[PDB]
Ligand code: HEM
Ligand code: HEM
C-alpha cells in the first residue's frame with residue numbers, strides 16, 4: 111500500500127502516506143510504467159460547453175473547502191459548515207460555484223506545493239496572488255499581465271507571482287493566453303525548413319504574424335502576446351520594452367563569449383497551464399518565479415531542438431569536436447551554464463544554480479514529510495539536465511502522484 | 525489512434541507505439557494512483573527464496589511460453605519439433621517437478637534476458653554474447669575455475685568480450701549455487717576507527733564477510749577482494765583471484781599531469797555476479813555476466829558518488845576551484861576532468877570502454893532496431909540517461925516505456 115521511500119546516499123527511509131489522498135490517475139499501471147512521458151493521452155482538460163456533473167464537482171469542492179478551513183485551523187467551525195452550504199447551494203442551483211479571494215490564494219499556493227515537476231517548491235508559501243477574475247476583455251488581460259510582469263521582475267529582485275483570470279464556464283469559450291510563456295523569442299522558419307531564433311516557438315511566431323504582427327529577423331526578438339477573451343479571436347499586444355528585462359550573456363574569463371550576442375530574459379512565466387482548485391478550472395493563470403541556471407544554460411541554449419549552440423562554443427574554445435570521447439560537449443555546456451550564472455549575478459537578476467536548488471528541494475522534502483507525510487515528485491524532472499548524480503536529488507527515491515489543487519496541461523486553443 | 529502507449533522523441537518529433545509491452549506477464553511497482561518508477565528496488569520482481577518446489581502449473585505456463593519464444597526465434601512455431609519439445613517439458617515437470625534446457629535454448633534465453641534488461645544501455649550488443657555452459661559444475665572449487673576462465677576470456681587482454689557463465693539451476697530439496705560478491709571484481713571497504721571507510725564504502729559488508737571467513741585484510745584504497753563461492757548445502761569457500769587475471773587501469777589525465785599522482789585506478793572488467801537469471805521459470809541463482817564499462821560508471825558514480833570514493837572535492841582543490849560556493853560549478857568542472865581521465869586512461873591502456881555519448885547514441889539505434897523487430901523496447905529512463913550531461917545525450921529526449929519481460933535478470937536476496 112504505502113510505498114517505502116529510500117535515499118541511497120544517506121540510507122534514510124520514509125513511508126509516503128500522502129499519496130493515499132490522490133484521487134486522480136496517472137499514466138502508469140502494474141503492467142508498464144510511462145513515468146518518463148511528458149504529456150498524458152487525455153488527462154488534459156476537455157472542453158467546457160456543458161456543466162460538469164454536480165455530484166463530482168460537489169465532492170471536489172467540499173474536499174477543497176475542507177482543506178482550506180483545515181489550513182486556518184477553523185475546521186468544524188460554523189464558518190466551515192456555512193461555506194459548505196453556500197457551495198452546495200450554488201452548485202445545485204447553477205451547476206457551479208465561485209471561490210472567496212482567500213480560498214483562491216490558498217488554492218494557488220497549494221497547487222504549486224503539489225506540482226511534482228517543480229524543484230523550487232521550498233518557496234511555495236511565498237506567492238503574490240493577483241485576483242484578475244473581474245476581467246472581461248483581452249485588453250484588460252493585457253493590463254493585468256503588464257502589472258504582473260512589472261511586479262514580478264522588480265528591477266531584478268524577482269518575486270514569485272500568479273495572476274488568475276476568470277474560471278471556465280459551461281457553454282462559453284475560455285479566457286486563454288496563447289503564448290506558452292509571457293516572454294518568448296520568435297522562431298522564424300525559413301525556406302529549407304530550418305529556423306532562426308527559438309525553434310520551440312515556430313508555431314506561436316507564425317500565429318502572431320497571421321494575426322497582424324510585423325516580424326523581425328533576429329534570434330532574440332521578443333514576441334507579442336495573443337490574448338483571447340471568450341468566444342472571440344485572440345488579440346495581439348506588444349509587450350513594452352521597458353517591462354521585458356533581458357540579461358546579455360558573457361563569460362567571466364572567456365572574453366570572446368560575449369561576442370556571441372547571446373542573451374535571455376529574466377522572467378520565467380508559464381502561461382499555458384490550467385489551474386484547478388476544488389473542481390473549478392482557470393484556463394488562464396500565468397505564474398512566475400525565477401530561473402534555475404540549467405533551464406537557460408543547458409536546455410534553452412544547448413538542446414538540439416532549441417538554440418543548439420554547443421558546437422559554436424566548443425569551436426570557440428578550440429575543443430576537439432572530432433570525437434565524442436574528448437567530452438567537448440560536456441566542457442562547452444559547463445562554461446555556458448557558468449556564463450549564465452555570471453551574467454545574471456552581474457546584472458543583479460535573481461537566479462539559482464542547480465546545486466543550491468536541489469539542496470533546498472531536499473530540505474523541502476524533509477519539511478513535507480513532517481507536514482503531510484510525503485511529497486509528490488517527478489524524479490526525471492527534478493534531477494537537473496547536467497551533473498545529475500552530482501546533486502542530492504539523484505540519490506533520492508521519489509513517489510509521483512496527482513494531488514489537487516493542481517496545475518495541469520491543457521489543449522492549445524487553436 | 526492505436527490502443528498502445530504512444531511514445532515520443534521530442535528532439536526529432538517522431539512517434540512510435542509500444543506494442544511489445546502487451547507481452548509482459550509480470551507486474552511492476554506502479555499503479556494508476558502513483559508512479560514508483562524511480563525506486564531502485566521495488567518489491568515485485570524481487571526473486572525472494574521460494575524453497576518448496578513451485579506450482580507445477582505455474583512453472584509449466586512459464587515453461588511453455590519460453591519454449592514458444594524459442595521456436596519462434598528459429599522460425600519453427602507450431603512445427604513438429606516444437607510440439608514435441610512442449611510435450612517433453614511437461615513430461616519432465618510431470619514426474620520430476622522441474623525440467624532442463626537444451627544447450628541452444630540456454631544460449632537463446634541468456635541473450636534474451638540481456639535484451640530484456642530495462643536498465644542496460646549497452647543492449648545494441650545483445651546479439652554478441654559468449655554463453656559458457658557450466659551446468660555440470662559440482663563444487664565451489666570448480667566454480668572458481670569456471671569464473672577464472674570467464675575472466676580470462678572476457679578480459680582478452682583489454683579487448684573485452686561480453687560473456688556469461690551459467691551454473692546449475694535451483695533444484696528442489698537442494699541448496700543454491702551462489703556467488704556472494706556483487707561483482708567478480710570489487711575493492712575492499714575497511715570500516716575505520718573514526719567511523720569512516722578506507723577503500724570502497726559500497727563493499728563494506730562483503731569485505732567484513734570475507735574477513736569473517738578467513739581472509740586476511742589489507743589496508744589500501746584499492747585492494748581486490750577474494751570471491752566467496754558457494755556450492756549447494758556447503759558453507760561458502762574463499763578464493764583469491766590471481767593478480768595477473770585482474771586487469772586494472774591506472775588513471776591519469778591527458779593534460780593535468782598531477783592527476784596520475786592521485787594514485788587512482790579501476791579494474792577493466794564489469795562483471796555482475798549476484799543477479800538471478802530466470803528462463804522459462806527455471807532459476808539460475810549463479811550466472812555471472814560481463815561486458816565493458818561506459819565511462820560515467822567509473823568516473824561519475826564510482827569515483828564521485830558521495831557514498832563511494834567521493835573524490836570530487838579533492839580533485840576540485842587540485843584544480844584550484846572555489847569549492848566554497850555552488851555557483852562556481854566546481855563539482856561540474858571536476859567531474860568532467862575525472863570522466864575525461866577515465867576515458868584517456870583506458871584508451872592509453874588499450875582497454876575497451878565507451879563514453880556516455882557514444883553509448884547513448886548506439887542505444888538509440890538499438891531502439892530503432894527493436895521497434896521494428898519486436899514493436900518496442902522496455903527501458904528505464906532514470907537508468908538509461910547518464911549521471912552527467914543528461915540532456916546533452918539523445919536518450920534524455922526519448923520517452924520510454926518500462927515493463928518486465930522474461931527471460932530476465934532479476935535481483936535476489938543476499939545468501940547471508
Ligand atoms: C521560486 C522559483 C522557482 C524556481 C527556481 C522553480 C524551478 C522550476 C524548474 C527548474 C522547473 C522545470 C522547468 C522546465 O524544465 O521547463 C519548474 C517547473 C514547474 N514549476 Fe517551478 N520554480 C519556481 C517557482 C514556481 C512558481 C511560482 C510556480 C507556481 C505558482 C511554479 C510552478 C511550476 C510548475 C507547475 C512546473 C511544471 C511546468 C511544466 O510542466 O512545464 N514554479 N520549476
Ligand atoms: C557490452 C557492454 C555493455 C555496456 C556498455 C553496458 C552498460 C550498462 C550500464 C551503464 C548499466 C548501468 C550500470 C549501473 O548504473 O549500475 C548496465 C546495467 C545492466 N546491464 Fe548492461 N551493459 C553491457 C553489457 C551487459 C551484458 C553482457 C549483460 C548481460 C548479459 C548486461 C546486463 C545488464 C543488466 C541486467 C543491468 C542492470 C543491473 C542492475 O539493475 O543493477 N549488460 N549495463
Ligand SMILES: Nc1nc(N)c2c(n1)NC[C@@H](c1ccccc1)N2
Nearest residue numbers: 146148490491492534920921922923
Ligand atoms: N526539468 C525538466 N524539464 C523537461 N522538459 C524534462 C525533464 N526535466 N526530464 C525529462 C525530459 C524528457 C524529455 C523528452 C522525453 C522524456 C523525458 N523533459
Ligand SMILES: Nc1nc(N)c2c(n1)NC[C@@H](c1ccccc1)N2
Nearest residue numbers: 118504505506507562564906907908
Ligand atoms: N545507471 C544508473 N545507475 C544507478 N545506480 C541509478 C540510475 N541509473 N538512475 C537512478 C539512480 C537512483 C538512485 C537512488 C534513488 C533513486 C534513483 N540509480
Ligand SMILES: [Zn+2]
Nearest residue numbers: 138143554559
Ligand atoms: Zn511509473
